[PDB]
Ligand binder design. Sequence first.
Ligand SMILES: [Zn+2]
Ligand SMILES: [Zn+2]
Ligand SMILES: [Zn+2]
Length: 47
Amino acid sequence: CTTYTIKSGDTCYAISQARGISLSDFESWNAGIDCNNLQIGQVVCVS
Ligand SMILES: [Zn+2]
Ligand SMILES: [Zn+2]
Ligand SMILES: [Zn+2]
């Protein structure tokens, strides 16, 4: 997994859009992530 660290204002949609990936694919790589409750410093997979 390529990792990314959540920063202020980030959203799962915007991370996905920036990388040209679907939000559903992103979710499939992120084990039930709570996209409405992201924490600054949280680490996600972007591939
Ligand atoms: Zn979803
Ligand atoms: Zn896909
Ligand atoms: Zn939530």
